[PDB]
Write a protein that binds this ligand. Structure first.
Ligand code: HEM
Ligand code: HEM
Ligand code: NA
Ligand code: NA
Lengths: 717, 717
């Protein structure tokens, strides 16, 4: 090999391929943002003329462009595929992917094999982006176009929320280990798909349209469909409705041999203006288009909503055949239905065809019961598809406070993890100060209050904006039983004591002021940090913003919240089972899910350690003689060369720090020691460990703590 | 091969290994900075107590620590090597390397083979860093410790300037293509070292201490010493003075076999706390230390300044021998001087020894004349070593205004590219407004005024902070003759006209007011932009900061400025010969040298195209119907899918853009089309090409233009 210039990718990872990469903590940096610090997308959206935008998109859909002519004179079906693929990268294990960031317009997503021809689809929408400018993000426009396509062709949607802020460099996500496009090294056992992946091959959205590993077995395909769609939060009914609703429209494209199609966009020459897959087969577009290599038109009305998909699926019998490009597909036996399917550009009619994965909807016994019902009750298909499409397009939107615009339906939905609206006045300064005194008098310790507030708030992940302290779900299933929240420990005791303080305050509060349990959990940790700071000689106030409300168990989908359980939390020195990488890599990944920077991660680790937030109160990394006071002792002692560190004499993967005499003075984990070992992290530790640093450390810790407490608080932003 | 998690380095560069990498435009981002917004290091170190700092460094140097015992009870010599190595990565071709960023504490430099044991040297100075905190950067401390070491051991230095600002992630620099440490794939012809490299092997500072490629021929080693030191801005006398002065102190380390030495720091295990090269030979430290593998003690007084080096070099005849580690070195013949050299820890005396590169100073005829002079008159060595050392550790400090503290010497120095002090009152806003009016009436076109101002200001490079518009050197050699600056003889007219305006204004100036030619060059460009903005329907004021002064030719080292001539400037669509990468890669490298972000680079390109700033006024990229008018037409037309782009029939790296009628409408270069092709850059073009974007584009362009104009203006910052 050869090292390259940095402008062509060269860097330190070339010399140390397995090295920790702190760059995951400065994605989408502000310097790369052309918007400027004061840009307020929520304010811009609040002025869009949605009616005019809808009409402009309708005009785009029906004005064929010569560099990519419109099938059946309507770009609508292409836009529905575009939006489904935009939202279709989402996965429940880490919440990454989805349409919330407009990542389809960036690498690697813009060059995935499954996203072929969507470069043209996005390009066709520039006249709309041009007209509305900063008032309309690409992220919102890409999925709104699909929604507009559905409605222009006869399907009434449940609603739509704006508010996806455009980003300026791609979100870097692990999509699999395979170094070859469409590769498959992600299965073990019978058919166990590797966590956290939610597609069957590298570069696919969900499953292979020719069946598993190219084998058109519809029964086996249904196994992959059920599992990948499950990992995108869709059940059997939602999955069938989505696939039936989608393939009601449009067609596939495989008019000629695939080896006439040029490189994907990121590998394409300059003159192609960011487009890829340039084909030399005929015109390369339109009637000669090659996208997937399959040549299927599902229904006889590809630009209209109706029930002809299930009517055709159950109306014919199906046999295996090949497309002009050599891909497996199915067509009606016995020449049935010849000439009944229209051609996109006025040619002769064709025969009915289906993908192997479409036939899964009829061959799989669960899908068959669902889809056969819709033969005589298409009103139930329309209702399920509207609910599933709405959930698909908004899955990573977070709390409903973020949904913007005039098309947001206000019905509450269980999958949105709803919290009640506020129904009383909120606590003010005098009540907050009075609730703080009850907490100090309750006997709850700094460790208990800090650990409980962190456990509730650190369930947030910025990937799909789920979790957080709002809802007070730490006292509900499944969070109250999570191992890292330690049900065996004081958690139930802390919950009971906080509920007593809540009831006690609410029975004598002024006016109709009342405090929620969810607010009291956060307030307790804030009050404990104020006490711990004073105990170290710092008079500081921790910010506190009220307004969290208390969800009930009936409003908390227990199974849905399973994916939010921390399998690792280096901020509590906790490492569960099943993590893909050593503990210091999972620490950085956890900090990324919390939207934390490297300095913010560093102050929080050092602070939480000396506050007693550790899992099971382990002494690992507690480099202080003044526990439960907020000092910078963690950083001072970590940089002390009077300590000699060694792997423990037990073979448990921890470390022993010995002083000059040989006595073990400290113990620590990989998460603890990486801050004194990694050269970029140690640079940060040396800032907070200096003689002048303790006021700055306390200030920075409180700021990072306040950030974590407020991660899900879009209701007051 | 397999793809990896982003937290383990995985990213888009794995899938497209040669893709344009915009990371070079968001290095050291603010979010990774622990110091925050208003932190001003210059303000901090300006109040440091230098006398106390020197005594604290003095105590560190004479207090041996058990994990790395001090040779001869004094760490001074180790700190001199540390400081020399910190500054020793600088190279003239692109100004990168040097000690100005403290990069020796980060990868890859902290793990270079030549920087072995310097991990321990930096570690010894944490007590000093800890005591002074944010008032003292690691960047300053590393070279100041070497400067204090010289003084502590009897050498009076020329002075010292503080002000090197610490960074928080490594600057990524092309150090060579070799993928193996100590590799050599950088020579062509007889012995032409690859530009921009200034070292003979990957991971070396300058030359191989065993001779070229490990062959101990002193005459051949002198060839490599002369060329690499030349590429580090040192002539023959400076080179010899540095080597003689340096090896007056200390010893090499090679007590045992080198395969007992463990991995470099970035590959070392956690328990070693960022240190590397852990050795299992004896104690692995002190008398058993293994650093380079050579075991040489140059002088009989390793902790004292005297003339021992050349006395020993010429007082013995030398023969080739081997160190205990198998490295080539020289020792005195016939057992001469046995037992005359002291042992670092009290062992028996040793015989005189020298490196093969030390013998170059006697074998090479140029070096021999220089070093025999110091054998006869040692007073001249102290003078030359002091001047070369001060230059070494300040070479990348930029304008003299950046030198802070009470140790800064007042003397003018040619290598600093000095500019005269302001001796008059500066023009006020009334005089600025008048001068802008006179420039716009002078008959100089907007193209001429913008081209000349950019040519003067864009000579700056942030790597070593050389160049820029201050000094008015656009009218002096060599800048007045650079191909990109004066292609067809137009620049002479522009200079004479601005000089006439300068003479006229100063003759009639009120009071003590005087304006410089250097300021007028910049002010002319700002007036031209105000005019072009009005032509496009935007009344705007371009900011201007007076205070530049006019350097003379006698104050302008003509050959030193040769490395600042652009071989490529995508902002003017100029591409000379000898570039290592295609033009769009050179564009990003240039923007990096101008310290520009990707949005700033994007607005400047689109603006300078329509302002007529292209080299030779080529129509490449001038996508507008209205030249001399500041519009966003570059971005609107670049996004126009009514244009079809193809490579020009002549394979000259240009493109033709044909509109609907197949007629050629626009032409462009690779630099132009990359903004419509690259997915991240096109996202920026779509911001500035929208209907709502004309006011924002004019604001952002003017701010970006003003930034480039003020790049070297450290006199006001
Ligand atoms: C098992 C799940 C699915 C598979 C295997 C699959 C596969 C495919 C393939 C291979 C194509 C042809 C692309 C081409 O050659 O142009 C296609 C087209 C399309 N897909 Fe799907 N898809 C699935 C689910 C969905 C869903 C859930 C939706 C929307 C809710 C959808 C909407 C569409 C539409 C509208 C088209 C037509 C595109 C056009 O007319 O250009 N699909 N699908
Ligand atoms: C051709 C140029 C040079 C070569 C090949 C060279 C090479 C070396 C080598 C191999 C070592 C031994 C490292 C070890 O094993 O610990 C060393 C040590 C040292 N170098 Fe140089 N060097 C050069 C120039 C310089 C310069 C210009 C300076 C300072 C102005 C300098 C200052 C030192 C000092 C003070 C030591 C002793 C370090 C100690 O005692 O630990 N050298 N050099
Ligand atoms: Na996501
Ligand atoms: Na530099």
């Amino acid at each position: 090999g050869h090292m390259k210039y940095p402008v062509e990718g060269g860097g330190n990872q070339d010399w140390w391929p397995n090295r920790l990469n702190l760059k995951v903590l400065h994605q989408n940096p502000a310097v790369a943002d052309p918007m400027g610090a004061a840009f307020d997308y929520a304010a811009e959206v609040a002025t869009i003329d949605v009616d005019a935008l809808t009409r402009d998109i309708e005009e785009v859909m029906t004005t064929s462009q010569p560099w990519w002519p419109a099938d059946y004179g309507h770009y609508g079906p292409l836009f529905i595929r575009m939006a489904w693929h935009a939202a279709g990268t989402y996965r429940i294990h880490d919440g990454r992917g989805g349409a919330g960031g407009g990542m389809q317009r960036f690498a690697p997503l813009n060059s995935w094999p499954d996203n072929a021809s969507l470069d043209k689809a996005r390009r066709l929408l520039w006249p709309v982006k041009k007209k509305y400018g900063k008032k309309l993000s690409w992220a919102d426009l890409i999925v709104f176009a699909g929604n507009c396509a559905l409605e222009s062709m006869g399907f009434k949607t449940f609603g739509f929320g704006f508010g996806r802020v455009d980003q300026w460099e791609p979100d870097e996500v692990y999509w699999g280990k395979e170094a070859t496009w469409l590769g498959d090294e992600r299965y073990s056992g019978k058919r166990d798909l590797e966590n956290p992946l939610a597609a069957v091959q590298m570069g696919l959205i969900y499953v292979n349209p020719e069946g598993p590993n190219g084998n058109p077995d519809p029964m086996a395909a249904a196994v992959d469909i059920r599992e990948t769609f499950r990992r995108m939060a869709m059940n059997d009914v939602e999955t069938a409705a989505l696939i039936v609703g989608g393939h009601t429209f449009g067609k596939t494209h495989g008019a000629g041999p695939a080896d006439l199609v040029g490189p994907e966009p990121e590998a394409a020459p300059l003159e192609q203006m960011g487009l890829g897959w340039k084909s030399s087969y005929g015109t390369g577009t339109g009637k000669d288009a090659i996208t997937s290599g399959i040549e299927v038109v599902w229904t006889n009305t590809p630009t209209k909503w109706d029930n002809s998909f299930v009517e055709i699926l159950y109306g014919y019998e199906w046999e295996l055949t090949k497309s002009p490009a050599g891909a497996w597909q199915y067509t009606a036996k016995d020449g049935a239905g010849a000439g009944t399917i229209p051609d996109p550009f006025g040619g002769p009619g064709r025969s009915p065809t289906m993908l192997a994965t479409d036939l899964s909807l009829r061959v799989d016994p669960i899908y068959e019961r669902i889809t056969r019902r819709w033969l005589e009750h298409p009103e139930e298909l329309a209702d399920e598809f509207a609910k599933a499409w709405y959930k698909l397009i908004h899955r990573d939107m977070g709390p409903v406070a973020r949904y913007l615009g005039p098309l947001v339906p206000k019905q509450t939905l269980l999958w949105q993890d709803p919290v009640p609206a506020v129904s009383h006045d909120l606590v003010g300064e005098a009540e907050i100060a009075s609730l703080k005194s009850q907490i100090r008098a309750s006997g709850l310790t700094v460790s208990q209050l800090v650990s409980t507030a962190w456990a509730a708030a650190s369930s947030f992940r910025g990937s799909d904006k789920r979790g957080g302290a709002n809802g007070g779900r730490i006292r509900l299933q499944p969070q109250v039983g999570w191992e890292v929240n330690d049900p065996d420990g004081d958690l139930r005791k802390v919950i009971r004591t906080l509920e007593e303080i809540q009831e006690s305050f609410n029975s004598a509060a002024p006016g109709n002021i009342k405090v929620s349990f969810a607010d009291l959990v956060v307030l307790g940790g804030c009050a404990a940090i104020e006490k711990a700071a004073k105990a170290a000689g710092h008079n500081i106030t921790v910010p506190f913003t009220p307004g969290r409300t208390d969800a009930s168990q009936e409003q908390t989908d227990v199974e849905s919240f399973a994916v939010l359980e921390p399998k690792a939390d280096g901020f509590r020195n906790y490492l569960g089972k099943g993590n893909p990488l050593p503990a210091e890599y999972m620490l950085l990944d956890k900090a990324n899910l919390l939207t934390l920077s490297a300095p913010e991660m560093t102050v929080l680790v050092g602070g939480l350690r000396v506050l007693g937030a550790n899992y099971k109160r382990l002494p690992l990394g507690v480099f202080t003689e003044a526990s439960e006071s907020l000092t910078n002792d963690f950083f001072v002692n970590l940089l002390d060369m009077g300590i000699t560190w060694e792997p423990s004499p037990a073979d448990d993967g921890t470390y022993q720090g010995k002083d000059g005499s040989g006595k073990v003075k400290w113990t620590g984990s990989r998460v603890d020691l990486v801050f004194g070992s990694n050269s970029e992290l140690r640079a940060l530790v040396e800032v907070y460990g200096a003689d002048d640093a303790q006021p700055k450390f306390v200030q920075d810790f409180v700021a990072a703590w306040d950030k974590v407490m407020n991660l899900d608080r879009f209701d007051v932003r």
